[PDB]
Amino acid sequence: AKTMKKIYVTMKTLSPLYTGEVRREDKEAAQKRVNFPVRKTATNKVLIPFKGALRSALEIMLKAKGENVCDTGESRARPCGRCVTCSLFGSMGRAGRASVDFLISNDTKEQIVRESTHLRIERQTKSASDTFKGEEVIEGATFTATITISNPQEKDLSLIQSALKFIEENGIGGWLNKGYGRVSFEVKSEDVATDRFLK
Amino acid sequence: AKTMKKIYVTMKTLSPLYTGEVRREDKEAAQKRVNFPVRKTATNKVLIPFKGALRSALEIMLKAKGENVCDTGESRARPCGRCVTCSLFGSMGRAGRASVDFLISNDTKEQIVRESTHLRIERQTKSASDTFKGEEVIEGATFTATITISNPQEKDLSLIQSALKFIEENGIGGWLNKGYGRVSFEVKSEDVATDRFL
Amino acid sequence: KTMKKIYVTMKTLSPLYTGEVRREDKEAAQKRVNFPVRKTATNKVLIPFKGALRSALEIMLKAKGENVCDTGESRARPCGRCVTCSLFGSMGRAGRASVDFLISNDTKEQIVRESTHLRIERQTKSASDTFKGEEVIEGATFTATITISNPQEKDLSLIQSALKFIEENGIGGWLNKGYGRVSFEVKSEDVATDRFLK
Amino acid sequence: MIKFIAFLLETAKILIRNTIELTKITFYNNSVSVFIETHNGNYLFSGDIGYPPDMPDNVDYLILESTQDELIDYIERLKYTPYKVFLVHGEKEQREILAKRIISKKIRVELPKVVLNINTNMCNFASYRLMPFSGFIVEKDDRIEINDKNWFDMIWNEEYNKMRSQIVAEDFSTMALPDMSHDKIIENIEYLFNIKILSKNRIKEFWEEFCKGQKAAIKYITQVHRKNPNTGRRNWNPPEGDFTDNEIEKLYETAYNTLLSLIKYDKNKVYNILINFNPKL
Amino acid sequence: KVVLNINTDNMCNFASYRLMPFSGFIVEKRIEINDKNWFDMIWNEEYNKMRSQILPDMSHDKIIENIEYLFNIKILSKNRIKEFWEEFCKGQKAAIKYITQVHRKNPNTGRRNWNPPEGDFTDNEIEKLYETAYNTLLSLIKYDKNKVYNILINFNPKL
Amino acid sequence: KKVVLNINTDNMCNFASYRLMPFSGFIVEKRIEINDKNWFDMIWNEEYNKMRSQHDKIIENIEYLFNIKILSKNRIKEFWEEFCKGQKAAIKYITQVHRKNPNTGRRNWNPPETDNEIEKLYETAYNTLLSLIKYDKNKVYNILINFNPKL
Amino acid sequence: AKRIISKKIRVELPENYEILIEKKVVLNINTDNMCNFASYRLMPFSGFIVEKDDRIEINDKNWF
RNA sequence: CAGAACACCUAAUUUCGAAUCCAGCAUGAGAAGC
Numbered sequence A: 001a002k003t004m005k006k007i008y009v010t011m012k013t014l015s016p017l018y019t020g021e022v023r024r025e026d027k028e029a030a031q032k033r034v035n036f037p038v039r040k041t042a043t044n045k046v047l048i049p050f051k052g053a054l055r056s057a058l059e060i061m062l063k064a065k066g067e068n069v070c071d072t073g074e075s076r077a078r079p080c081g082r083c084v085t086c087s088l089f090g091s092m093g094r095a096g097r098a099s100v101d102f103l104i105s106n107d108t109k110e111q112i113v114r115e116s117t118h119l120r121i122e123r124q125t126k127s128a129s130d131t132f133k134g135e136e137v138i139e140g141a142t143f144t145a146t147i148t149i150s151n152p153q154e155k156d157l158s159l160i161q162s163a164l165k166f167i168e169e170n171g172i173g174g175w176l177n178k179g180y181g182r183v184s185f186e187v188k189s190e191d192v193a194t195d196r197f198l199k
Numbered sequence B: 001a002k003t004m005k006k007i008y009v010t011m012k013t014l015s016p017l018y019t020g021e022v023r024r025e026d027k028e029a030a031q032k033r034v035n036f037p038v039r040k041t042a043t044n045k046v047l048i049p050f051k052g053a054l055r056s057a058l059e060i061m062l063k064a065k066g067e068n069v070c071d072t073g074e075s076r077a078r079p080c081g082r083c084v085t086c087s088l089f090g091s092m093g094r095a096g097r098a099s100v101d102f103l104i105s106n107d108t109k110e111q112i113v114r115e116s117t118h119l120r121i122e123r124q125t126k127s128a129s130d131t132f133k134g135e136e137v138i139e140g141a142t143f144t145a146t147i148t149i150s151n152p153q154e155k156d157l158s159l160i161q162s163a164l165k166f167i168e169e170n171g172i173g174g175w176l177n178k179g180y181g182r183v184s185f186e187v188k189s190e191d192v193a194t195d196r197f198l
Numbered sequence C: 001k002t003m004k005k006i007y008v009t010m011k012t013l014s015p016l017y018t019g020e021v022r023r024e025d026k027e028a029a030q031k032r033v034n035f036p037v038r039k040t041a042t043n044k045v046l047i048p049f050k051g052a053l054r055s056a057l058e059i060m061l062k063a064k065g066e067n068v069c070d071t072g073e074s075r076a077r078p079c080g081r082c083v084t085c086s087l088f089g090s091m092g093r094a095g096r097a098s099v100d101f102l103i104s105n106d107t108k109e110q111i112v113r114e115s116t117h118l119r120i121e122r123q124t125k126s127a128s129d130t131f132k133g134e135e136v137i138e139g140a141t142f143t144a145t146i147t148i149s150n151p152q153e154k155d156l157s158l159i160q161s162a163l164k165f166i167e168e169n170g171i172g173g174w175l176n177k178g179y180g181r182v183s184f185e186v187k188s189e190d191v192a193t194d195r196f197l198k
Numbered sequence D: 001m002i003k004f005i006a007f008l009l010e011t012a013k014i015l016i017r018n019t020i021e022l023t024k025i026t027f028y029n030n031s032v033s034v035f036i037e038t039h040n041g042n043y044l045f046s047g048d049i050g051y052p053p054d055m056p057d058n059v060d061y062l063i064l065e066s067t068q069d070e071l072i073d074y075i076e077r078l079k080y081t082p083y084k085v086f087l088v089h090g091e092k093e094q095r096e097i098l099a100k101r102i103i104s105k106k107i108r109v110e111l112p113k114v115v116l117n118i119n120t121n122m123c124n125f126a127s128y129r130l131m132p133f134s135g136f137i138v139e140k141d142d143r144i145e146i147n148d149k150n151w152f153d154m155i156w157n158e159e160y161n162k163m164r165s166q167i168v169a170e171d172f173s174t175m176a177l178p179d180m181s182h183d184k185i186i187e188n189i190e191y192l193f194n195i196k197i198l199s200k201n202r203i204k205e206f207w208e209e210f211c212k213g214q215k216a217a218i219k220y221i222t223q224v225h226r227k228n229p230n231t232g233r234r235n236w237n238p239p240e241g242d243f244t245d246n247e248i249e250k251l252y253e254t255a256y257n258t259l260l261s262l263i264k265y266d267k268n269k270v271y272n273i274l275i276n277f278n279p280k281l
Numbered sequence E: 001k002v003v004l005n006i007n008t009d010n011m012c013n014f015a016s017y018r019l020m021p022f023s024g025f026i027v028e029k030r031i032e033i034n035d036k037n038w039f040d041m042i043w044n045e046e047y048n049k050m051r052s053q054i055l056p057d058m059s060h061d062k063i064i065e066n067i068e069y070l071f072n073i074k075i076l077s078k079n080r081i082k083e084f085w086e087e088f089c090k091g092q093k094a095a096i097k098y099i100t101q102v103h104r105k106n107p108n109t110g111r112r113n114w115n116p117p118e119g120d121f122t123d124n125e126i127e128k129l130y131e132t133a134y135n136t137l138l139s140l141i142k143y144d145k146n147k148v149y150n151i152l153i154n155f156n157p158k159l
Numbered sequence F: 001k002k003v004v005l006n007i008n009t010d011n012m013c014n015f016a017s018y019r020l021m022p023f024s025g026f027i028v029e030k031r032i033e034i035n036d037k038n039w040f041d042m043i044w045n046e047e048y049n050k051m052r053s054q055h056d057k058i059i060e061n062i063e064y065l066f067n068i069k070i071l072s073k074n075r076i077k078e079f080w081e082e083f084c085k086g087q088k089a090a091i092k093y094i095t096q097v098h099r100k101n102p103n104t105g106r107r108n109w110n111p112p113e114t115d116n117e118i119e120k121l122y123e124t125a126y127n128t129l130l131s132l133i134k135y136d137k138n139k140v141y142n143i144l145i146n147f148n149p150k151l
Numbered sequence G: 001a002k003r004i005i006s007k008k009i010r011v012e013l014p015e016n017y018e019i020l021i022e023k024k025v026v027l028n029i030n031t032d033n034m035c036n037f038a039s040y041r042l043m044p045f046s047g048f049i050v051e052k053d054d055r056i057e058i059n060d061k062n063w064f
Numbered sequence H: 001c002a003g004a005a006c007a008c009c010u011a012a013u014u015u016c017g018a019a020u021c022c023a024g025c026a027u028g029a030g031a032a033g034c
């Protein structure tokens, strides 16, 4: 109501980072050169989705704790509107209090995105069957995001921080199984006034 | 009465921008090739509804200050016709002083509108349960809107800029929780004698 | 629920060469070295661990004789119904075991050296070709973890069997020349998925 | 920016030794010329020439006229030689013959919506540099851009896709579907309407594809019910409830059978069926 | 008068009215109605003038049967059918070049750029399935745009 | 065998010695006519339509609900329009606007100017006008004249 | 600086440091005969772009 | 008019850089003032 939580999230990259290009035209433009383009902006910056990773993290950990959280990851599954993640990230009735931005990079592709080569070793002759080139984000690349909770309760800090620690465990996006996407987060949280901008 | 405030707003997208397609025939024509088309003109330019964004921004921030501003957010609500948003954006008995133009882009669809691939991932299996396509307006795309205020007071400028910083913080359009619609505003204000066409 | 931490430590016992995959890192090192080592932008040496583990498990389990597909032939589609498909992934479910990369604990200066190799003419017994590469020295320590999301009973012993195959046969490139012989130390722990939830 | 007609000058919108300050305007004698100063320019409208005139103090632009030696004498003796001279008010061949001599003193001449090239080759044929090109002139509402047949190819293919996916073979035009009584249709569509497999969007889409003929409705219900070979996923909304996996399939089969059995009912009859569920149409 | 220069196959039946979705060029020549082919030929004719101044045949039912069979073994996926629609729509020389590109056995690796068949087949027959795929997708280029779209939207709707 | 064109032949380009215009077609067979998309949108609509061819207590309660705006001038006009239409349209109308949507939960009445009191006042509107749906039409006219001046 | 002022071209020293030069693009072809296909006011034209110093022009076959 | 710190010879070369799945649902269609 009168107050609102601002969570400035600074993410550093440790392993290589991949998030696939979602725009059709940008992707098909890049498939003349690279087979797995990094999700990039038109201002030449790296765009990573961040709301769904936080929601998936909090869903898995709250489900393992034993809380009454619906699973919105199942195919066309309706959120019930009474879970904690429904109050934070959203339900069908009401939107989420937390409005997570994309992880906008602090640099610009040509300093952080490199074109890499991955293969498929044939297991008995030890030769390369397939060879594919994919773009990735270097390690130490800095990404910025802000999580703006409109109506803060007390848990909305610690739940977001716990989900961020889960994203340090499993990775933020792309090929999480091959070791990509391992990142760290720093959190600067403040509770601003909603009427701050009114002079 | 003798003056109008003119607010030339140029807004540039710092994020992907989604607002929804409104026209039924345009939507159903583009519910086949894409599943969330963005709002277009028939001159193929992107429309964003701007008045409701400013009105919502001012109503949340003015209820935060404790001023006796009403709320036209709940279902079938009533403009009280006595607040400063009621004076600016209108009531049922009196019109709005601030006529707020649509956010008209300067580019067309092939320059700023890109189709996409949005997903829904199963939490346990880590596989894409759902796929759906949705158009978005690119980052760095810039839009114009002219807000014209008849009978200006002293504080219309400050409230409109404050609403624009709130729109920068929250976003404009749809999918605001996923990071869409975060923008930046530039404002060129000018005082006008209303008879400049004569 | 539970998830299994497998903290994996590699000590290099014979010079380790894995190849640089980044094009900008490789064609700017071509004036110096004809075979760069895979490095980070933090200048620590990266080794791909997953494919070595999965190749190991296909070779050993196919020799023992169970239904395990091959993911190594030309465009070899995984089946989804085997132990390797459950652990490391398929075209349906993802891999239950997330295998992090092998990043060295020391930066490039301590562990990467720039060596000279040759091709000797078999008749004249003279140097016929000469090329420079980069190798990770012996005793360099690389740290990974392996996380198993849905842990079954056999999974630690299966991963450690693949880690014994990689100790004997090797990891990286130039494997038949003696390059890449390693030793693994593994500390395992089972952790609950609600651990960061205070 | 000068617009030729006399001589208009758009900065103040004036159109052509004491100093009158409107845009610093000052009239020097021709033996008369006017020197105008603005932040974007130091223009000089000379008028005609007669022999020792009064050239201004930097004349960024010098708009002169002649119909020959005196023009060039005046082109020199002016401190800080102009960026571009303009050759007006004369015959074209004599203007070109003078202009060759202003090029020989290394000073540029010009003889009297924004348009954007989205082109990409060059040729050095004749005195001027060029690139032969056949293309398209689009006239957008604030730009005029130039394109080639690749862009026309892309919008032609978009028009072909948008016009092919717009008219089906036998829709709104004039057998072997299942059959089931009206009471079981009531019970099934009530049951499949409380849980969300048959929802108001799906009843409405059944209504449009039934109004477009029976075969359009059969095609729609088949492609809704068609299980994918790969994902094993049908285009129904999932039922809200415990239903574990097999009565999920029997329930989608119930939706398939109930809609397909409702197809051969009369159009007014399926209307009296559906409006209890979706009041709109 | 006015002359249509289009064969009127692929005419649907909207209610009691036969109907064709079509794109073309009004030519004030005989007021001719000309297709896109006309435009491509006349564009290239003016390109050559400007710059100057300075397939095997298969039956339709065999095409459906073979594309059916190659769809079931996933040699011809919908990614392939979609990109073949892009390269046929762009033109015919592009579709020839694309199909030769995916069928070219690379001399250094021995690999065709098709998708491998699903199921057990001998390597000679897997190669014959590849040569069959070359023959049908090359034979498809000899037809017009309309029958190519109508053939491949039964397999990739959206192509 | 004859051909007739039905699209404007006025706003057409000129290029490469042919006066040409890219145009979208809807070739009809009867002669062979070439129509645009306005004719096809027409026919699509007209085939659609073609298929689409087939006593003091009530005074006190209405005086209460006029002030908190639950019943309104449009509501009085349309409820009186249902009453002037008859009695079946009245029951259908108040059933339709009292119908709380099971998905959202919002009634079609105008909000009062708790949820229990909201439900009680909406039920008061139901029993008020459903009581008024059974009285004589003259009494409905004189009661509705007091609050809506036009009807 | 004094000698290059004597040659009558202008000097900006760094410690002692405003025309606009639009490299304009202009169309010299008929514009009236245009149609609509995909809500675009287009016209096929064939000609010659001529990159002249300080001005890119698009000139018809008549100019060439 | 700016960097500057026992012996040779070498330090190149060649393949691949693709293939596939999915692109669906669901809600809301009213008010009120003049």
Ligand SMILES: [Zn+2]
Residues within 6 Å of the ligand: A069, A070, A079, A080, A081, A082, A083, A085, A086, A091
């Ligand atoms: Zn929920």
Ligand SMILES: [Zn+2]
Residues within 6 Å of the ligand: B069, B070, B071, B079, B080, B081, B082, B083, B085, B086
């Ligand atoms: Zn108010």
Ligand SMILES: [Zn+2]
Residues within 6 Å of the ligand: C068, C069, C078, C079, C080, C081, C082, C083, C084, C085, C086, C090
């Ligand atoms: Zn398998």
